[PDB]
């Protein structure tokens, strides 16, 4: 990226590295608006131009929003898919080559699986958890093994990569979740992929736009992206992890009648057990 390069959306990827604590400066990885990101964006723009589809989705969402979560409406229609990293960004962050493969992936709160699918080619077996009925159906159409939310900790095997993308701010017990993850991650070579939207603002999605506060508190604190990232090493340490690498990445989402796509600000970490 260049300081005068147009249409690179620098604000999606740069941080003020001097605002990071020294240990985080050493492991920050710069990401860029790459080919796979642009395909997602160009796909979303096209989709947002299918007016009859958008109008149908918007009428169904309006009629049934009182009876079903937003997540379940999206899974019902197959809409509003999201993007965290391209295969290239995922591989550069994990430091693996395009052909690297291992045994088992577990993707917790996998949504409709369109982010899971970026990671899937690197694994022989893919497992996932999810609370939304329609999202479970989307995961099963992708042939992922859906485990109960208290089933994955008790399978009798460990997981070589556990991904926990944008769930910590949406689940009831994030600290119990992190500790469960550590207890079943393969310890000699396993890694955790974690994504968090900053500013950290957690809640538990319910029906009808309703929501609840989580029953466990993550101690994420700061006045900007960098300070909040700075609070995370100690949060991960409590759960038995150190950050091996991390990056800033736009958390992209397909659009609707009003915008071609939507953006949130993701911090994405590779954790190793300690």
């Amino acid at each position: 990226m260049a300081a005068g390069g147009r249409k690179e959306n620098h604000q999606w990827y740069v941080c003020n590295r001097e605002k990071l604590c020294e240990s985080l400066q050493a492991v920050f990885v710069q990401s860029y608006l790459d080919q796979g990101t642009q395909i997602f964006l160009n796909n979303s723009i096209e989709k947002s131009g299918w007016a009859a589809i958008q109008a149908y989705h918007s009428a169904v969402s309006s009629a049934f929003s009182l009876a079903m979560s937003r997540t379940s409406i999206n899974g019902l229609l197959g809409r509003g898919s999201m993007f965290v990293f391209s295969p290239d960004q995922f591989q550069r962050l994990l430091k693996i080559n395009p052909d690297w493969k291992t045994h088992r992936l577990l993707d917790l709160g996998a949504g409709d699986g369109e982010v899971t699918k970026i990671m899937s080619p690197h694994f022989e077996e893919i497992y996932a958890t999810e609370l939304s009925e329609t999202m479970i159906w989307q995961l099963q159409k992708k042939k992922y093994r859906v485990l109960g939310i208290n089933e994955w900790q008790n399978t009798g095997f460990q997981y070589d990569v556990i991904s926990c993308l944008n769930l910590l701010d949406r689940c009831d017990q994030p600290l119990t979740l992190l500790k469960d993850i550590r207890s079943v991650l393969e310890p000699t070579r396993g890694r955790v992929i974690l994504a968090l939207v900053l500013p950290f603002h957690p809640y538990v999605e319910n029906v009808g736009g309703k929501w609840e506060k989580p029953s466990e508190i993550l101690e994420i604190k700061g006045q900007n992206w960098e300070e909040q990232v700075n609070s995370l090493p100690e949060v991960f340490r409590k759960a038995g992890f150190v950050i091996e690498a991390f990056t800033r990445l736009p958390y992209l989402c397909e659009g609707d009648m009003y915008n071609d796509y939507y953006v949130l600000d993701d911090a994405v970490f590779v954790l190793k057990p300690v």
């Binding site: 989705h57 918007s58 969402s61 937003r70 997540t71 999206n74 809409r79 509003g80 898919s81 999201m82 949504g111 944008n166 949406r170 939207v197 500013p199 603002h201 809640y203 999605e205 700061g222 006045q223 900007n224 909040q228 958390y251 989402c253 397909e254 609707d256 009648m257 009003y258 939507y262 953006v263 949130l264 600000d265």
Partner: peptide, 12 residues
């Protein structure tokens, strides 16, 4: 209007 599927974002 559905917005971002992850929900609405607050501030620091």
């Amino acid at each position: 209007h559905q917005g971002h599927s992850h929900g609405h974002q607050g501030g620091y």
